[PDB]
Amino acid sequence: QTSEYYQEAANPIATNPALWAKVTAPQISWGSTDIRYKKEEPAPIHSAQKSMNLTAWKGEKISAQLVVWTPKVLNDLTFMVSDLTSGSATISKENIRTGFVRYVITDELNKDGLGACGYRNSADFDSTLVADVIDHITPTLTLPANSTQGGWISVNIPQGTKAGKYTGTVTVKADGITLSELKLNLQVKNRTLPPPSEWAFHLDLWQNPYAVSRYYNVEPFSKKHFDLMRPLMKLYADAGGKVITASIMHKPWNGQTYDAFESMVTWLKKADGTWYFDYTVFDKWVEFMMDLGVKKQISCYSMVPWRLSFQYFDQASNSFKFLDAKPGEVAYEEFWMNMLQDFSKHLKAKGWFDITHIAMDERPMKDMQETLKVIRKADKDFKVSLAGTYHKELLDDLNDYCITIAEKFTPEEIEARRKAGKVTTYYTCCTEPRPNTFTFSEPAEAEWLAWHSAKENLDGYLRWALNSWVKNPLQDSRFTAWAAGDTYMIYPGARSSIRLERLTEGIQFFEKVRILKEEFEEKGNKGAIKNIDKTLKMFDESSMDKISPTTAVNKAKKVINRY
């Protein structure tokens, strides 16, 4: 707890005392989970809102944000929430989680506003502090004069909760005494959301265990490392996480993240022409993630790193060597068949073969086909995955196909993949200015991603970096490439973000849309299916100028919750 306490970076923007002149005393108000409140300016809240009305299903996790802003020092600010009660029924406060919404340095899109890819020097972009970290650890914070602070509240509504109107009190305190109370009303609906383990939504946020061992300076795959990773990775499992990331060779992504991915497999070329392969790391990591509930799929990276230089341990010289070899070459085929055939046997002995995918990447088409030929030569039943662009010739060969937000599968193609038991999703990355999960992206954008999956009749959503932390991820989210926040969505101390929380809200609403449509399909209610479908039409990547992501998300959540 205490060794996770931390200080934010200095604000790049000076506090203008003139902006604070109207603020006569500390103010405490409900705000919005759509808003990242600036630290150095008063909250844009015309006058304090004392009551919050929420609506939800049994089983659902729902958020609210309160905001505190003060013209004077407030020592040891805290807040807490009572039990919520409703006649004889009560939602216990143990189901309620609180956090300070803390500030990380962020930058901006590329200067043209049209994307966020490319190498960056920090001097070439703006820098500001933005509210994003959900700090559920630090019990109190002392606010200086002329500052604002958000507070996040998560209600994890139990499955067994009786339907009705619950009420509770949020108490906000500083230097020992109660500054304000806020009222919280929750209309719990007579419908039930399954727990995260039962969500259909295929969420894949690639995990970097090496970032955690580096940041805490512990030996990789030690008990300490796993202990630190447990609640952290649990954030992804609790969001519906379906896929385990596995690095089966040295640097699948050429060390593009602050922490490179090392191999979870020993590749030992013995001096007698034989090979020893050992999966002890891989197996420990997989079993760990599976114990956490992430067990749908394992994705293995990469046969196709950008530099096409493949490490092995060379016994004869007792050193690491590199094989330079490319898809379409005999040396590449021989090197990878040798490993994959061993790996196949290993997976089959572990009983993980049916779920293990060898991951392709977006490359010139002749090279992608050459890689797939090697995979099937190694084992004809290896499953294969790709996150990239639409390629009609690969549709049948890819068990997991994640497409750029820019391109669409046809209804029939989606249907054939669903009937075949395959997985079909989309991704955003540094390309899209919006919707996205940069640290400056509007909070609602992250929820919009899940709704968009529902509009497109896709299974899920993928993004390339759950936790590939930069050097000081709590303080500063910028990196030497891409817009800030592109490399992680969760923080040290197993701390969530506004981004992951809003994404997880959208995922929940995606499950609600599946549930409701199932019901209306069995009940034959055609009018409701048309109305849900019409609502989903707002989630189009070209509608965002006409209907903002925030407006879309809010309209859609209200429509769904009436049913």
Place this chain on the structure above:
Amino acid sequence: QTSEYYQEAANPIATNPALWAKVTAPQISWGSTDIRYKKEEPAPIHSAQKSMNLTAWKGEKISAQLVVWTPKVLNDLTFMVSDLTSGSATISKENIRTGFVRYVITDELNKDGLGACGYRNSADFDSTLVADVIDHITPTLTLPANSTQGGWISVNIPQGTKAGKYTGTVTVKADGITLSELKLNLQVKNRTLPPPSEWAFHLDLWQNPYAVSRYYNVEPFSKKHFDLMRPLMKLYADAGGKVITASIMHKPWNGQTYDAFESMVTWLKKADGTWYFDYTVFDKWVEFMMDLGVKKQISCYSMVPWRLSFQYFDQASNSFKFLDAKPGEVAYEEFWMNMLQDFSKHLKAKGWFDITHIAMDERPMKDMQETLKVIRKADKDFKVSLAGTYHKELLDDLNDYCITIAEKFTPEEIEARRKAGKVTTYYTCCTEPRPNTFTFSEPAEAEWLAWHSAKENLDGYLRWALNSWVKNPLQDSRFTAWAAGDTYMIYPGARSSIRLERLTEGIQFFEKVRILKEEFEEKGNKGAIKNIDKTLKMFDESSMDKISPTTAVNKAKKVINRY
């Protein structure tokens, strides 16, 4: 003209169609002289900018870059500029030169990002096309589908121009028809910039006549050779060039460039123990450059080639021989005294002795002192130069002292050298990742170099290769040593570069600063001197990560032009 047309190399980077999928028509905008637009990506411009506002002095040369990008073939792309009119007055379009900003192959820094020195095999380094050639010869270009083309515009404002606001039209055409009209506004201020022959800035960019004779396959120092050199060397003269490179012996740099330097002096050792020296080539070359306006200084290379092996024509055997001799040896002294005493008499007969420098180079201190002893024994008034590191022992011996960017003379040292009429400058080379004039360097870095001279109170700037062309310099700027572009900054056809144009703007601003400070000293305006010096402090080689070279240059140009 037509003998100077050429084709670029093929782009090593395949075009990515997803980048172009929202480009629905050819687009024409003003862009920035800070940017090398990539050929295979759409211009990073949110909304076409139809107007450009420039400010300049009477006498100044000022640039703008426009950019065209297209999702379809455009045949015979072309552009031209109208006269610039201000009510009754006119800047004739005769003073305006245009060019296509054409693409040359380049590489990158050393893999560690810390420097760019050492031998290279091009297969070990990345390859890309970068915009850098100012092609003012080729009248039209056809652009393929999904491509981008920059256009450079240089406005040479006459001395006589009346102060006021001038307006003109840039007309872009292709396929026959007119694609766009762009507006160009130009505030001519009531200050005069002298022509280049009057600039104080000591620019030294070492010339290689032998590259030109090789590339055009013509005899060295023939009329055709000189005719080819004239407009090419005039680029250097129009940038402020002050120094004539002379090779007074065989291979002063041991053929480190693609084209070695031959001796511009015949060293004939006759069979009666006497010598005959003939300076006909030296004299033709020097007179030629003087006629172009390069006449402040002649630098003679080299008493100190790495290999310390000195060619001479031996009459007795009717053959070239070599003397192997080192500084601190009697044979070295006897051989060099003999030539230098003849050379001294010849230079005095020509009236060039006062401007002629014998160039030393960075060697162990004892070797450098022994070389200096020979020079002074030959003639006690010979001037001497050095480009190297700081040596307190040599400060009063060196009439021209150019130091690495990383090291600094004291203010007291600079002042004494200035008051003594000596020259004091700095250089960059393959060492510095920035600021520099590699073909991948940012355009503003080139300008920054001249501002840095002003910040440091130095006389100017030196670089070791004006035009030491590689094999195919219009296509491929890479070499078997150093980062691409290290060996030349001007191109066949007397074509400038973005690097030369930007450096020359920096030199002009150095002169504006000189002029403004002389006037403010006379008027007593101590507040404006201090404001200028505060601005110059941005040009610190240490603060480039806090203030980008591009930001520093841009803020500085605005501050200076408000005066």
